[PDB]
Design an enzyme around this catalytic site. Structure first.
Site, short mmCIF file in Angstrom:
data_model
loop_
_atom_site.label_atom_id
_atom_site.label_comp_id
_atom_site.label_asym_id
_atom_site.label_seq_id
_atom_site.Cartn_x
_atom_site.Cartn_y
_atom_site.Cartn_z
N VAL A 89 48.70 82.49 52.27
CA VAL A 89 47.58 82.42 53.27
C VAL A 89 48.38 82.56 54.73
CG1 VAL A 89 47.49 80.12 52.90
CG2 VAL A 89 45.67 81.10 54.18
N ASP A 130 39.26 74.38 40.65
CA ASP A 130 40.66 74.28 41.20
C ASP A 130 40.19 72.97 42.42
OD1 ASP A 130 43.59 74.18 41.57
OD2 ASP A 130 43.51 76.40 41.83
N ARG A 190 44.67 70.06 48.22
CA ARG A 190 45.06 71.07 49.06
C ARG A 190 44.04 72.17 49.23
NH1 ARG A 190 46.50 73.25 43.55
NH2 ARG A 190 45.72 71.38 42.24
N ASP A 209 38.90 78.03 48.04
CA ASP A 209 39.57 78.10 46.79
C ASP A 209 38.70 77.92 45.33
OD1 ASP A 209 42.32 78.68 47.82
OD2 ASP A 209 42.61 76.41 47.98
#
Ligand SMILES: O=C(Nc1ccc(OC(F)(F)Cl)cc1)c1cnc(N2CC[C@@H](O)C2)c(-c2ccn[nH]2)c1
Ligand SMILES: COc1cc2ncnc(Nc3ccc(Oc4ccccc4)cc3)c2cc1OC
Ligand SMILES: [Cl-]
Length: 420
Positions: free
Chosen positions: A182, A289, A293, A307
């Site tokens: 990213v 997920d 983070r 995500d």
């Protein structure tokens, strides 16, 4: 009165967008397909303007103390940085049309209800009723009249309203992250900072990467990151999303100044994440997920979740899984509820590594009884994450149930008070 007033500053820098300064007068000529943009005429020119950035003149939103639909704990966070007399007026999210006054006094935040009588005259205390909300707020800004203090200082807005689509209707690549996938970058046509994710394959298939993103393009929630664009024409596929300045939630939490980021802030972020998960679950989308983070932090502790549908990628992820998700490859919201419970443990612990406990035997460690109390975590919060970790997935609360609990957990208390 047919006229509109700008509530937030907006820099045009777009196809035909119009720059507006807070308080400018506007005449609306039309709207776009989704209604997120509307054509406006001002003393300077004509052009498109975000619809949530301006309000009708007859509107109660023209006032600074009216924050519209605001969560109770979101209002509590808004008043966390205030003084005596700091106040706001909000609409109830659970049942619209119900109005509340949140007033800060000597470190406390008090919530009052604006009840309507048979005459239709709204009131806080039965001895003083008013035809309009502006009259009531002016009177209670003149004298306390049953309130703990006068409504003296309207609370500032937490963030500018979220818009969907950079326009009413590949490019520059900046620095990545530093290391330790990213990249940050610029879109020239709208001259804005975005985040670009590159990826290989396995989950990112040939036709799935386009048909799944179509469902993802319809993901529109304030606490969910917005998929601005996709580029599948090159071997590295590009995912264009909004940019959050503070980055990783885990990195924020571990490096944050806890005097600024206090318990009220933590519950604000938790409520944001829970509302995002409720939106995802009600649409029957599975994140898969969920963790710290994959969350991002924005201005005034604005938290968004990314995500989702990503499943693979990055990976340079065992403790956030459901016991039934890695043993038998399950796909469900309840696995996301378990991941949410682990996430809330992390938030309560200010970013500690989960299960601190042998990994090679953790599964078994769960077949019989789970992490203990973090220091200062209210027993209600531990109870919630306890329910989020159930061997049988059916016994875990829905994300809507989790949000409803979170909002009503401290109705007669404060999370700062209930630390110990
Ligand atoms: O505010 C705290 N917890 C919190 C806030 C909101 C919550 O509700 C929710 F909804 F936001 Cl999750 C749930 C929990 C908190 C304060 N101080 C802590 N310390 C103890 C050691 C000292 O150095 C600092 C810890 C702690 C324990 C372990 N690690 N850290 C946590
Ligand atoms: C200041 O530091 C950061 C700012 C960020 N700002 C926005 N986004 C970030 N991460 C990201 C970007 C795109 C992406 O792609 C998907 C988006 C949604 C769903 C699936 C994939 C996934 C994560 C950021 C990461 C950062 O450092 C980790
Ligand atoms: Cl409005």
């Amino acid at each position: 009165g047919n006229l509109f007033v700008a509530l937030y500053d907006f820099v045009a820098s777009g196809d035909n967008t119009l720059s507006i300064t807070k308080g400018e007068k506007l005449r609306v000529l039309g709207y776009n397909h989704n209604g997120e943009w509307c054509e406006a005429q001002t003393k300077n020119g004509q052009g498109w303007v975000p619809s949530n950035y301006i309000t009708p003149v007859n509107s109660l939103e023209k006032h600074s103390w009216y924050h519209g639909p605001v969560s109770r704990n979101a209002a509590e966070y808004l008043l966390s940085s205030g003084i005596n007399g700091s106040f706001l007026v909000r609409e109830s999210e659970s049942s619209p049309g119900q109005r509340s006054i949140s007033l800060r006094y000597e470190g406390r935040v008090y919530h009052y209800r604006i009840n309507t009588a048979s005459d239709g005259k709204l009131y806080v205390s039965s001895e003083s009723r008013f035809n309009t909300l502006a009259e009531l707020v002016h009177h209670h800004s003149t004298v306390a009249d049953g309130l703990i203090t006068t409504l003296h200082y309207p609370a500032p807005k937490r963030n500018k309203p979220t818009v969907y689509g950079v326009s009413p209707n590949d490019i520059t690549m900046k620095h990545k992250l530093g290391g330790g996938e990213v990249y940050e970058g610029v879109w020239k046509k709208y001259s804005l900072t975005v985040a670009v994710k590159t990826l290989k394959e396995d989950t990112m298939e040939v036709e799935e990467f386009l048909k799944e993103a179509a469902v993802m393009k319809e993901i529109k929630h304030p606490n969910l990151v917005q998929l601005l664009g996709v580029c599948t024409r090159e071997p590295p596929f590009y995912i264009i999303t909004e940019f959050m300045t503070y980055g990783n939630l885990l990195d924020y939490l571990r490096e944050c100044n806890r005097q600024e980021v206090n318990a009220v802030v933590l519950l604000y972020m938790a409520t944001q994440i829970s509302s995002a998960m409720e939106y995802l679950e009600k649409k029957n989308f599975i994140h898969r997920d969920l963790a710290a983070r994959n969350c991002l932090v924005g201005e005034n502790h604005l938290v968004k979740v990314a995500d989702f549908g990503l499943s693979r990628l990055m990976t340079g992820p065992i403790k956030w899984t459901a016991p039934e998700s890695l043993a038998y490859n399950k796909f469900s919201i309840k696995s996301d509820v378990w991941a949410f419970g682990v996430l809330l443990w992390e938030i309560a612990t200010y970013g500690m590594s989960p299960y601190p406990i042998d990994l090679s035997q953790v599964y078994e460690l769960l077949e019989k009884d789970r992490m203990e109390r973090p220091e200062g975590c209210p027993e209600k919060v531990y109870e919630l994450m306890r329910a989020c970790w159930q061997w049988n997935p059916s016994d875990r609360p829905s994300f809507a149930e989790i949000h409803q609990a979170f909002e009503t957990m401290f109705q007669e208390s404060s999370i700062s008070d209930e630390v110990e």
